[PDB]
Symmetry: D2
Subunit: 398 residues, 4 copies
């Protein structure tokens, strides 16, 4: 029942925000509105709904009550005014960019981006007259310099693969604030529990709820959180007319179920990651480790200023790159070889022999991916079992 | 049998196509793959799956086994090569159009279109440099005269609201074949059971499975069926990168459940609609009726030429105009006042008093919105009850 | 939103009975109350809820809102006052029998019973001091002669496997009314669409909703319909205390989805069964057929008094016995070799070589299990496909 | 992935036990087998499946693949040989006892039992010739004296309400072994994570998975874990014939999803309860406090010998009697007034004014039901929020 406004604690709000059982027959768990359409008692009522004069529903693609609860909750957790639920993280990203951008507009992007986001920008909306430019969001001088009068939005992830490179959200937001640019941050890795970009100046945040938010890898979903003004536009244009990325109320319910243990799951992911990162740091076979929790992390101070905890993701490089990375991966027995992250199950991937195996050392390298870089999404399994798997696989990678 | 093999009938394929229980633990009903990611036995197998040299899965947004079954079944029903499942009908149309059009390209559109696709075209892609032009798809001469070297796509619904105006599919297809253009037909109203555009020459059909295909209004989904070449492209570009309109395996399973009774339900929708249409024709309150089943239907011959049955949708005008339309709508007891269609539950709507109620008679008249036009989605209820509800509502319109 | 607005038709009630969207926010499909517990505004409201003086919920095992809708709808379809939803058909019968019988009580049973019902009666409750006696429910004289002051319950299925033996329900109810016994009829095969035992005098009807009612083989469920007093006792005792066969709100919503097309499906099942039955009758491999639709059916007249249509189940004996039965069964390609019935998918079974393959010809004959009897659950596939399958199977069965 | 009961760790087994993604198309999350029947490739295969010489399913009431994973996983967590999934905790309790006991058998019960379990014992099986006797399972002297050659099973909960009274599980097990009685413990409150009765000597454990195992209050389910020989019997008779309390694969999947965070949720439930119990113990409105985590807890030492943590349940007594409880309960803002427990949401109940408001201080005082007894199911909310709620309610109880 306990609302938000950020009064009750985070765990309380992640469980109760926006829902009062007394308002729904006393049902402790909200009933799921698995219906596409809603009916009107009167024609004058339906009209009032369409004209926004009366609060109600009429069609789930535009708005569904079960989705509305998820949206209100996520908004509360992120500290924003409004939320919007979508069929996937890409759905949230595209619906967002498709409505804020038009030909002639420029979009300043972080140096690296999720593959599909990159693909979408360069071979998608980029091919429709939108200008794109990659800049280091940590370098506020370089950013301020790339700012033009056509820069309409600034988009990036933080941390961003492959080295978990961070950006100065507040620094970026201040520059964008003076230029009239819109800042949107993909806060998938941290979640509102570890980082809240909106509180640092960002205008909007996007999430692939398919990851940590759901936490159990049984749904693909996306979330957008920001001001009412901005979110309304994305709902009514990006979502409604473009993309049509509608989230199933069933999936919205499973996501809210996942969010109920968000703080607890993130606490374990991070606790587990820290021990694994430190164990890796002691391995002679490991050349470099990209984990915000290690004191030698290049952006350690900035990370600590934006994230409450170092996260559950680890990237590291094996000396003797490809081959050691391939042997390692193939020896794993608890960790799963798969793409994705934020599941209870621990996952691992070695781009050099997996996603970018088709490239050549040169291609790969001249593109940012090392030959021995493996990324792990540390799960919730027992740390010693995980350490034992990595230890056994490290011996095999030899 | 079981769908393909020999040449099973429609009902047989609607319930068995693509699935042999023997291949899945003997489960009569296929297990639901409610999973976001899939793992690999080796890094090599993963790379191979990415490169497409290996038949497998890795991420549900790109492809999921439950969705694949639905896709293949729908492809069989439409007489096409391949299918794609999306989060909604709009996800299916936007996904298709985003991958087939680029600035400079021109798309020829039916005279009237579903409200959201119209908004998508004129306020979406159209604002990204794509040329839009509306032509009467029933007028094969005007269509050919509009064909240009820039024409890339011909898109229309058949029948189309609000008069169920038809288009000569085989006709526009031959012109398309002679002048290039790709033909996309929105077959939502008919479903593959009543009309198969691909078999008449269309290249692709899009469906708002949220309607007749699901049949029970508890899901929002979309379908695209066409050549492997075109579908592969829409899957890997429009869905994957530009829309993220991913269908939940849960909803896909529910949709396949609904498709299992497609022929039976459509048969009843049509039978009920015919009786209702013939009944409305003898009523003094009705000024005009738009039902493909009435011999006086302007395109009676073409309709009987393209559709196996006249459908379950009826539109008719009330001599009384908006007031009569409103009074009629408010008096209904069995039919529900709501947008959407194709549910077991009969729905009715009066655009002039509902969606465009705030418009002016002139503004509404301009868009082609009549003052006394009401659209009926004839449900599966007992015809006697429906006739009674309509009768009394007609009397109440006085 | 009818079902009750002046005794609407069967189809109208199977779709709307008990639900008005306007009472649930306009949601066209009812929201699923997938919640275990319910909260109270005051401890006073709670007590009144537990006390029964308050209309509410507190715990789903006792009563749940979506299960309630299904219960009320099923009650309307069978013409009974109350309904109860359970986890399975066996949960419905055991829950029923557990609350009505006590040691010393006598229960007269139909000559034949569903496999598990027989085992529950004979090796279950029957082993807790309750007395059993099997009698031909068609022979009203033998039944009368069987009544004792200890006779508390009369239980049977109608039609009953394996010969579709019918019982004189109105006659049995007469005798029970005189002796003060409760008549419980298993109406699984016919469904309330083809026979309503309560209207012929039975006191309670039980269903394995797993079959025809769901119609799609994706759920296990049971239903009980009868007087409010009887059902209140079965709910508060058989279910909740002696059986914890709670139905999942998800499976209940699925059952209700399936019930929305019950008339349509049963129509097709029977129509398909009729032609297959007559086809079987012309084949020399078939020495005997058990189908209510053939005028040669022994109880053809009685069957036609209680049943609106002859049903979707057909049983027949193959000349050649076991050998031919195995051959026939193993040759099927559309029909699936499995137990159960009532699915869109045609099912077939041969007891002698399947469930009773272990027995000896004599042990089976002793148990009324013929050597060449095969039972078919005629599905919704195209008859031409169904006929071809059995046709080739008969040729192989030779 | 990594199962092996005991090594790997609990969290690892609660996440991976019994499931290797590689065997199911690489699906990270196991596909849900929401099907009622299973088909065979030949009748001889079906026959072997019915004779037990063939591995394979045929009907979900008896056994389902999804339920089987849930079962194997629960068996591992409890350290047992086999598990069984059912529609509810009562389904597990009743299915177990219905197959173990027969007329003439005697059963010794803990002094206090879950409401419906008590009703089932006394007004259910009790009325079928099975003898009952309540003995303090903490008094090994009394238990031994109570033993008789007719004692068939010893049944109890530990902790048990209303004071969280403990039983010496290893103690009663030794006695039971001596005489030859079957010990079954309702381990609902603790979960295999906090207590493993089977490792203490018990023969069977039953759970209301509706509570902590699910953890999110959206499903009703029960679990039985024990020897293979025992569980097989309860499956083939108790569930199959006498109860039919079949668990829906969908609900079993939600259960498994909940179990994936069992350790994390319990850790938090206990941490929160520990803090609330200590606060309550120092409040002037509280006469008594029952929390195993308090050093002053009567059976503190025995509890710590059986439980790894003190649990999330707490009961205390308000000095002001029924009047103080009503005012307390009615003033609760975050805690919900409702029955049940084990949810992410904190629940509270006052038996005197709720479930037993009907009773007079008659048997209420006779069944140990103090007039001021309040039971709290401490949830996962922010402890600061929970403290404030209880604190304010405490003040209002005056």
């Amino acid at each position: 029942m306990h609302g938000s406004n950020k009064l009750p604690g985070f765990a309380t709000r992640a469980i109760h925000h926006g829902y009062d059982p007394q308002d729904h027959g006393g049902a402790l768990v909200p009933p799921v509105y698995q219906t596409a359409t809603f009916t009107f008692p009167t024609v004058e009522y339906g009209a009032a709904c369409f004209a926004g004069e009366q609060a109600g529903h009429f069609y789930s693609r535009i708005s569904n009550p079960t989705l509305n609860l998820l949206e209100a909750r996520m908004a509360s957790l992120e500290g924003g005014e409004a939320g919007l639920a979508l069929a996937s993280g890409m759905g949230a990203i595209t619906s967002t960019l498709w409505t804020l951008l038009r030909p002639g507009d420029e979009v300043l992007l972080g140096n690296t981006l999720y593959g599909c986001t990159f693909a979408f920008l360069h071979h998608g909306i980029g091919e429709f007259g939108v200008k794109l430019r990659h800049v280091d969001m940590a370098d506020l001088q370089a950013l301020e310099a790339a700012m033009t009068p056509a820069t309409r939005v600034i988009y990036f992830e933080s941390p961003a693969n492959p080295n978990m490179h961070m950006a100065d959200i507040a620094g970026v937001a201040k520059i964008a604030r003076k230029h009239g640019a819109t800042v949107v941050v993909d806060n998938t890795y941290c979640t509102p529990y570890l980082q809240r970009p909106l509180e640092l100046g960002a205008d909007l945040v996007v999430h692939s709820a398919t990851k940590y938010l759901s936490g159990h890898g049984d749904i693909t979903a996306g979330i957008v959180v920001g001001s009412q003004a901005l979110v309304d536009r994305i709902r009514l244009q990006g979502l409604k007319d473009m993309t049509g990325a509608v989230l199933s109320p069933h999936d919205a319910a499973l996501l809210m179920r996942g969010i109920k243990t968000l703080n607890l799951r993130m606490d374990r992911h991070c606790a587990n990651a820290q021990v694994l990162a430190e164990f890796l740091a002691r391995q002679p076979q490991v050349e470099l480790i990209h984990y915000p929790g290690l004191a030698s992390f290049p952006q350690y101070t900035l990370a600590r200023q934006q994230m409450s905890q170092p996260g559950g993701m680890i990237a590291f490089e094996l000396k003797g790159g490809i081959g050691a990375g391939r042997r390692f991966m193939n020896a794993l027995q608890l960790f799963s070889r798969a793409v994705s992250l934020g599941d209870a199950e621990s996952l691992a991937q070695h781009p050099a022999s997996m996603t970018h195996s088709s490239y050549t050392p040169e291609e790969r390298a001249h593109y940012g991916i090392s030959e021995g870089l493996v990324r792990l999404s540390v799960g919730l399994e027992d740390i010693d079992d995980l350490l034992a798997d990595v230890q056994q696989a490290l011996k095999a990678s030899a």
